[PDB]
Design an enzyme around this catalytic site. Structure first.
Site, PDB file in Angstrom:
ATOM      1  N   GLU B  60     -17.704 -26.529  13.454  1.00 59.75           N
ATOM      2  CA  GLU B  60     -17.539 -26.676  11.983  1.00 59.75           C
ATOM      3  C   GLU B  60     -16.400 -27.661  11.705  1.00 59.75           C
ATOM      4  CD  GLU B 284      16.424   3.678  -1.473  1.00 59.65           C
ATOM      5  OE1 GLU B 284      17.630   3.914  -1.696  1.00 59.65           O
ATOM      6  OE2 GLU B 284      15.638   4.518  -0.996  1.00 59.65           O
ATOM      7  CE  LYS B 423      19.158  15.122  16.465  1.00 56.65           C
ATOM      8  NZ  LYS B 423      17.703  15.271  16.698  1.00 56.65           N
TER       9      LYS B 423
END
Ligand SMILES: Nc1ncnc2c1ncn2[C@@H]1O[C@H](COP(=O)(O)OP(=O)(O)OP(=O)(O)O)[C@@H](O)[C@H]1O
Ligand SMILES: Nc1ncnc2c1ncn2[C@@H]1O[C@H](COP(=O)(O)OP(=O)(O)OP(=O)(O)O)[C@@H](O)[C@H]1O
Ligand SMILES: Nc1ncnc2c1ncn2[C@@H]1O[C@H](COP(=O)(O)OP(=O)(O)OP(=O)(O)O)[C@@H](O)[C@H]1O
Ligand SMILES: Nc1ncnc2c1ncn2[C@@H]1O[C@H](COP(=O)(O)OP(=O)(O)OP(=O)(O)O)[C@@H](O)[C@H]1O
Ligand SMILES: Nc1ncnc2c1ncn2[C@@H]1O[C@H](COP(=O)(O)OP(=O)(O)OP(=O)(O)O)[C@@H](O)[C@H]1O
Ligand SMILES: Nc1ncnc2c1ncn2[C@@H]1O[C@H](COP(=O)(O)OP(=O)(O)OP(=O)(O)O)[C@@H](O)[C@H]1O
Ligand SMILES: [Mg+2]
Ligand SMILES: [Mg+2]
Ligand SMILES: [Mg+2]
Ligand SMILES: [Mg+2]
Ligand SMILES: [Mg+2]
Ligand SMILES: [Mg+2]
Lengths: 470, 463, 467
Positions: B60, B284, B423
């Site tokens: 093409e 944000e 933790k």
């Protein structure tokens, strides 16, 4: 150099920012879509804009519509084509039937070099082959190839039957063309949403995915989501909220260039804060728009008059503009365009949406968020202090401020809530948070009278207040 | 079966070496998937790496077009084509079968190449008739001993692999390029359906098209030490017992306006002063609002950027897909070489995406800051203030090494905050809910919440 | 069911159990697949296993692939067709274009020429890519009937377009044959899960539905996740956990033949309990495997040392092996495969998975359960004490033990939970249960330091906020 592809600015609102320049020069661009997507309009705007902005003569090849209909239709968008046809700046090639490729290529090449036309628009090739999936590929490839050598930038219209089916009618046209644009008219529930998409641009880069757009009296208006983008100016200025007690609770006024969100159960006093908020701007000779979505203009006025606020006065003075509408009366993209149109014409200092929760009804949480980003983003870019309302589906059921999760898109949060105290139904105002300023952290009790809201003192001798029953 | 490396960022890993040598590899996909770009990177890299001659057959497009579009990325298709290293065999019909194979073998030899790229084999037959014709092409090519890349086209994104349903069974190696619609956002993935006679990575892998061509992202070999860095908050360093480990993933969580965006400020700064480079990925807040706010707390991000010891990014999570975002954070970490990285926030990038897509993202980002020994603080807002039962709504707690719990506590009509180290993997931390307030200087953690029970609920009942 | 049909042993891992003996003798079996599903690799492993384990001569009929490539491909797994061919044990009866009664004549020639018992055609479709439904049906029949007369157990390969559409490319081949097998390669949100199914075995019984399988360096590996056993083999032999205080609450440690599950919120000590569980093995001179899907060998050894444990040394004695992987790398089928293969090359006394919850992320609830029954049933069938971890999505107010509902497949449950005590976050360990033993039916305090766990004295502590 070279080291890229030269582009041709279309001048269509938003399309130049998605394509990163416009339509690749000399190449052919496929623009396929279902019936009434804006294909014919896109190809017209492509030419009209080329002439009115750069004096690039255009050729329009029609197969169904009559040259006279192409001009009468373009009349709605307020542009005169008959004046451009006479100036020899635009030529409408009528290749329509009446009561093979070679003959057309001839006429198109005849009218190109005759008018020194730099832009071309065919609408719509499909109607011509109306054969075999293989035949259309060859016949189409032949046209696309012949147009390439001339060095003319073409816009080919293609028809579709499915909103998400094959890109083109025969599922072949897409690979023949270098550039492909898909115009969609998707149906949500009973509302139509317009989206434009650049599938591919052989050579150069672009923005990927669908982008919301509308068809107005100005033509096609696209909105680049994040273009570009999170770069609005932020001033340390302060603006009154319309309530002295709330001014102090927020460290002495709101904040010019900020999004405020008043949340609570139904009847907590959200429309009051909005009333006092819009009235303050008008008490300083500043313009304000109140986008009402759940009350008639008549009711807002009568309720505001019971709080000691004359909305009719502020309206007669042209400082206050009330825009009421049904959220379900239109798509979220239409509301956004409406709002942006109002801020440009009226040019207000303050904006209010009563309420956001009403626009979030019977819609995807994703479509609503993209809406809130557009309204908040546009308001922040113009330094227009905006106050958004949000009704809680739950009364006396804490958890999250909003059910839409728009907390992170807001800068200031005014929390209104009911509190059962001694078999009574009291109310408590609270500045949940305020970015860039100290704020009162007390759960103050407030009442409502003919004189607006009287913010009293917090409930020191009470635990479990946020529960709604301490 | 030997495979010749392609040098296409990520493909050699998924294919486990590259493309089966002396075998045709089918690459089918819809319009604008990267089928054509894939074939050009095949010959180009094969040359600019190994001087291995390569041939390209078009049906093409025009040679002039290939060379034209070939630029974009800055590829000298001109010099290479002329230097004798590359050749483009046209084949497109005049605008106004066996000869092809004969023109191809004559080409493979006339240039002495071991890399061929057909594109596209569908343009031709325009599938009992395509089965035999496609069989003969691929067949005669196996003898020439050339590693081919035959491009095909598809209509549906999750339908048939090829046009007629045989191209796959004829070819030995099949790759599928996709452009899936992820609700208004486009996500291109690459998958190797089959590699006859060799092992590969099954399933789809996310990739992106950029200036350096394609960048596929495949997917635990890391490396950590005991070295500890500061958090910007002297006390928070004491609560963590020396501070955060150089190579570690930290996570500050809480409701909205708790102080996660604040901590991110102090964290990015603890690098600025130390004469280290810190990148801030904000999704944000705008650059302006951050700086204004960054200042209202003391730190001067305006100056920290001028000294070239900080890089504020800023972007909409809805601007692009997770894959695109990941490629930015990456391509941005390699053009700055920072010591630590901050993300505000994770909940922002989780919005409008599937938990699965988001997780695959958080891992890929994290799986990077580690294989690079970079400190990574990630922010997350809980869409449930007071009465929440979970560290995250996306369940990413077991992907991070540290956790900072920020919650609201109602102490007699007063909205008070409470910091905590939930933790700390491989270290001691203060295991108590500490009350802290925010001033114009930053955080100030005070005494605990003794004389109160059910602090977790957010509405305690004093003892 | 008096006399059942004689079946031919396939020696394909798992297939003989699903088929209830193998492929019915004298009849052809259809193996429909969707390209790269393993139709060819199946037809080869069928002949190979016959020639190598039964001296059953095999004939492989190729219609597209060259006998060269057929062999060249087999070397991938470590098979040598070139050899088995030089001996006249196997014959690749090439038939690739450059009919009907021609192929059959050539076939019967080879079958009798080699005394071959196993035949495999791949594929009876590309032969038709050069027709109409009416033709193929009668064409496919002439082939089968002839082979049924010769008495050769055949395996005919067929191609599929859709994963859940028609069985064959024409909707015919599914009825011409007596036996139908469906090889699928289903896309499960970016990850691929290949499953084998026996649609029908005329005249005999079989296992129905889809069975997960993997293609590795040892050919096709099926997992009949359905019927096998649950005969088992258990004992009252006890095993230490490496805490001492816990072994006490367990009534003298864990059972050697049992499944231990350590559940709790994040940062509770699920990883610590695994470390202590592993060290105990390297001390009792026992090999132990560790499957870490959350942390890396580096982070493990570093976090392990901080608890006074030399993970680096335990491995330097060929006594411990840490298998660090990503749950997002491959699918469950591929994990269960890596896990089994790992146990068969080391033969450990105990294995610990960190964690089950990490493997249950982005996968359906049924696919996960299947996987758990897989590693559980396998760890038990080899008398190996398995300790599995599981993180809880929520803390303080956990309605159930596991969100995946895995509790009733475990024998011992070690419940860990956070307890808020006066603005102070404390930990509490508990033995929720033990199949056939007494346990401390009490929630005890628990601290972590330079060493490891220290189960202090006991104490509504369940809500996470006691009174
Ligand atoms: N002044 C206007 N204001 C708003 N909308 C308008 C205006 N004029 C036209 N439209 C809208 O634009 C559409 C016309 O678009 P256009 O004719 O380009 O579509 P198309 O995709 O080419 O359709 P078809 O394939 O059927 O020819 C109409 O559906 C109409 O709703
Ligand atoms: N003149 C008045 N005197 C006393 N209370 C009044 C007066 N006018 C309104 N209110 C109180 O204010 C409430 C309505 O306030 P407002 O309209 O601002 O509420 P809202 O939060 O917007 O509710 P909704 O979301 O349902 O519109 C009434 O329920 C009533 O208790
Ligand atoms: N410089 C660039 N930077 C980024 N993206 C680019 C750049 N140049 C091209 N692209 C993108 O890469 C894609 C590569 O297209 P490609 O030619 O590989 O598609 P294709 O699958 O061959 O299409 P078709 O099937 O229609 O032939 C283009 O669609 C374009 O969007
Ligand atoms: N040595 C190997 N180790 C691991 N996996 C392998 C190995 N060799 C091949 N494979 C995998 O197994 C597959 C082989 O399947 P096979 O070639 O039988 O497909 P098929 O179903 O016959 O396909 P088709 O219908 O196209 O002929 C390959 O796709 C590859 O992923
Ligand atoms: N100068 C200041 N003095 C006092 N309090 C301040 C000051 N600046 C900010 N604050 C308080 O600190 C908070 C800052 O919120 P921050 O952005 O750090 O948290 P966040 O949870 O990341 O927020 P978001 O959810 O909006 O992203 C505000 O709620 C405000 O009450
Ligand atoms: N050297 C140490 N001294 C004291 N306490 C420590 C030490 N190392 C770790 N801890 C504590 O013990 C915890 C580690 O437990 P472990 O790593 O087993 O958690 P877990 O339940 O597996 O969590 P996750 O699933 O998130 O990894 C840390 O969060 C910390 O509170
Ligand atoms: Mg039209
Ligand atoms: Mg209202
Ligand atoms: Mg192409
Ligand atoms: Mg923030
Ligand atoms: Mg095969
Ligand atoms: Mg752990």
């Amino acid at each position: 150099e070279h080291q890229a592809i030269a582009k041709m600015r279309t001048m269509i609102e938003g399309f130049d920012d998605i394509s990163h320049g416009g339509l690749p020069i000399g190449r052919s661009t496929l623009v396929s879509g279902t019936s009434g997507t804006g294909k014919t309009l896109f190809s017209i705007q492509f030419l009209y804009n080329g002439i009115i902005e750069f004096d690039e003569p255009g050729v329009f090849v029609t197969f169904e519509e009559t040259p006279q209909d192409i001009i009468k239709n373009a009349r709605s968008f307020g542009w005169d084509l008959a004046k451009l046809v006479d100036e020899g700046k635009l030529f409408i090639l009528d290749a329509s039937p009446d009561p093979d490729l070679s003959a057309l290529i001839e006429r198109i090449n005849y009218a190109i070099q005759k008018y020194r036309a730099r832009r071309v628009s065919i609408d719509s090739v499909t109607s011509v082959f109306q054969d075999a999936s293989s035949v259309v590929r060859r016949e189409l490839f032949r046209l696309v190839a012949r147009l390439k050598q001339i060095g003319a930038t073409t816009v080919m219209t293609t028809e579709r039957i499915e909103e998400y089916g094959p890109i083109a009618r025969y599922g072949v046209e897409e690979f023949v063309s270098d550039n492909v644009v898909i115009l969609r008219n998707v149906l949500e529930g009973e509302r139509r949403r317009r989206t434009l998409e650049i599938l591919k641009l052989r050579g150069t880069s672009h923005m990927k995915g669908e982008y919301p757009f509308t068809i107005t009296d100005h033509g096609i208006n696209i909105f680049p989501l994040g273009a570009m983008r999170l770069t609005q100016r932020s001033s340390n200025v302060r603006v009154s909220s319309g309530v002295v007690r709330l001014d102090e609770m927020c460290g002495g006024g709101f904040f010019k260039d900020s999004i405020i969100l008043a949340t609570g159960a139904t009847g907590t006093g959200k429309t009051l804060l909005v009333s006092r908020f819009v009235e303050n701007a008008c008490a300083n000779k500043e313009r304000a728009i109140l986008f009402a979505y759940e009350e008639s203009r008549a009711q807002l006025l009568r309720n505001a008059y019971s709080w000691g606020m004359d909305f009719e006065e502020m309206e007669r003075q042209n400082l206050l503009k009330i825009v009421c509408a049904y959220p379900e009366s239109a798509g979220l993209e239409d509301h956004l365009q409406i709002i942006k149109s109002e801020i440009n014409d009226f040019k207000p200092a303050r904006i209010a949406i009563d309420s956001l929760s009403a626009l979030a009804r019977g819609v995807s949480n994703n479509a609503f968020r993209q809406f809130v980003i557009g309204v908040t983003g546009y308001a922040k870019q113009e330094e227009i202090t905006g106050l958004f309302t949000n009704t809680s589906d739950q009364f006396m059921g804490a958890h999250s401020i909003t059910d839409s999760h728009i907390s992170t898109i807001t800068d200031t949060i005014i929390l209104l809530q009911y509190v059962e105290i001694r078999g009574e139904m009291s109310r408590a105002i609270n500045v949940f948070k305020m970015r860039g300023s100290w704020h009162d952290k007390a759960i103050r009790e407030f009442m409502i009278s003919d004189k607006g809201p009287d913010i009293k003192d917090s409930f020191r001798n009470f635990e479990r207040i946020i529960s709604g029953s301490p």
